[PDB]
Amino acid sequence: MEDYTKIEKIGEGTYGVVYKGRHKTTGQVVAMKKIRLESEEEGVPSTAIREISLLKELRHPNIVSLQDVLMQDSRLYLIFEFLSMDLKKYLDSIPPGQYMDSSLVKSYLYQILQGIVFCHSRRVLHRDLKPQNLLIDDKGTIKLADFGLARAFGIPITHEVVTLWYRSPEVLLGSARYSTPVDIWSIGTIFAELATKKPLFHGDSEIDQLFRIFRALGTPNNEVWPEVESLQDYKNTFPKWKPGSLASHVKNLDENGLDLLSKMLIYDPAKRISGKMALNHPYFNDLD
Amino acid sequence: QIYYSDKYFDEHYEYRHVMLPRELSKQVPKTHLMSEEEWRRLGVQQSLGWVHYMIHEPEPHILLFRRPLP
Ligand SMILES: CCc1cnn2c(NCc3ccc[n+](O)c3)cc(N3CCCC[C@H]3CCO)nc12
C-alpha cells in the first residue's frame, strides 16, 4: 500500500518477515507482517481473509491489535501496533546470575492469561505461543501476537526446534483434535521460563520433547490420563518415569507458583486448568 | 552428518537416540525395527548392547536405542 513506508526489517517469524514501518499520514510507527499467499485455484477462495476480518475487530490491552490488512494479488501485509521488545530477546538480555524479579513474572503471567482468556472466550486459539510471540513495551505491558492466524492460514498437511518446546502432549502424541487447553500448556512452559530464564522442556525433536516432558511429569498411562493408551503414537515401550520431579526443574517459585504451574501442566486436556480458573489462583493474590 | 543425543535413564535401561540426515534416512529400505548388523551398515557407532526398540512414526529418521542397566 502507498499509505506506508517500510523503514527496516525487524525479524523473521512463523509467517515470514516483519518490517518496521511508518504510516505516511499520521507518523504512526507500525509493524508490518508480510505473508506470502499462494496463487489460488479459480473458483476456490480461501477462508483466510474472512478469518482475518474477525481478528481485525479484537481489541484488548494484552493482545497486539491488528490495525489493518493490505491486499495485493498473492500477497498480504498485516499491520500492527509496534512494540519495543520481544520476550525471547529480553530474557537473553538479562545477565547470567540475575533472574527476573518474581513480581514481574507474576505480572507477566497474569497479563498473558488475560489475553488468552479474552481470545478463548471468542473461540480464538493461538496454538503456537512462545516468547518470540510475546511483546513488551517499556512500561510493564505484555501482549500476545499471532493469535488466530494458525486457523486463518495453516493446513492439515523447517528447523523450528524452538517452536517444539511449548507444544502440548496431546498434539505430540497425535490426538485427532485439540482445543484451548494447548494454549494453557504453552503458558505453563513459558511461566517456568520466566522464572528460570530457560526452557522447561528443551527438546531436540518431537520424540525427545515427549521424553523431556515424561521425565518431569512421569510417563502417562490410562490411570493418569484416560484413554491415552489409545492415541496413535502412544507406545508402551516409552521410558518409565514416575510422577515428578517437576519442582526440581524450577527455581524462584514458591508453593503457590508451583501449584498453578502443575495445574497448567496436567496431562489430560479435559482436566487441565482453564484460563479463567488460572486468573483466580492464589499465586496472583499478592499481585497488584 | 549424524547427530547423537545425550544418554537418559529409566530405573531399568539407559537410552539414546540418533538423528539421520535426510539423504541417509531416505535410503533405508527397512520400515520396522533393525538388528545391530543393520544399523551398523548405516554408520551408527555406539558401544555393543544397544537395541533399536521403537519407532516414533512421525519421525522415522530418528532411531531410538535402549540398553539395560547392571
Ligand atoms: C505483531 C508484529 C510486531 C510488533 N512488534 N514486534 C516486535 N517488536 C520487538 C522488536 C524486535 C526486534 C527489534 N525491534 O526494534 C523491535 C517483534 C516481532 N517479532 C520478533 C521476532 C520476529 C518476528 C516477530 C514475532 C511475531 O510478532 N513482531 C512484532
Author numbering:
A (entry chain A): 1 to 157, 161 to 291
B (entry chain B): 5 to 74
Would you copy out the relevant sentences from the publication that reported this structure?
Members of the cyclin-dependent protein kinase (CDK) family have diverse cellular roles that include regulation of the cell cycle and transcription and, in certain cell types, differentiation (Lim and Kaldis, 2013, Malumbres, 2014, Morgan, 2007). CDKs share a conserved protein kinase domain that comprises a smaller N-terminal lobe linked through a hinge to a larger C-terminal fold (Endicott et al., 2012). All CDKs require binding to a cognate cyclin partner to remould the kinase fold from an inactive conformation to one capable of phospho-transfer. We have used biophysical measurements and X-ray crystallography to investigate the ATP-competitive inhibitor binding properties of cyclin-free and cyclin-bound CDK1 and CDK2.
Crystals of the CDK1-Cks2 complex were grown in the presence of each inhibitor. However, only two of the resolved structures contained unambiguous density for bound inhibitor. Dinaciclib binds to cyclin-free CDK1 through the core pyrazolo moiety, forming two hydrogen bonds with the main-chain NH and carbonyl of L83. The ethyl group pendant to the pyrazolo core is positioned up against F80, while the core is sandwiched between the two lobes through hydrophobic interactions with A31, V18, I10, V64, A145, and L135. The 2-hydroxyethyl group of the piperidine ring interacts with K33, which stabilizes D146 and potentially forms an intramolecular hydrogen bond with the pyrazolo core. Extending from the hinge toward the solvent-exposed selectivity surface, the Dinaciclib pyridine oxide group stacks up against the main chain of I10 through the face of the aromatic ring. Comparing the Dinaciclib-bound CDK1-Cks2 structure with that of apo CDK1-Cks2 we observe a slight, hydrophobicity-driven P loop movement toward the inhibitor, which results in a reduction of the active site volume, explaining the interactions we observe in the crystal structure. Dinaciclib proved to be the tightest binding inhibitor, with a measured Kd of 0.96 μM, while the binding of SU9516 did not reach saturation under these experimental conditions, implying a Kd greater than 20 μM. The relatively minor differences between the crystal structures of cyclin-free CDK1 and CDK2 bound to AZD5438 and Dinaciclib are hard to reconcile with the large differences in affinity observed in our biophysical studies.
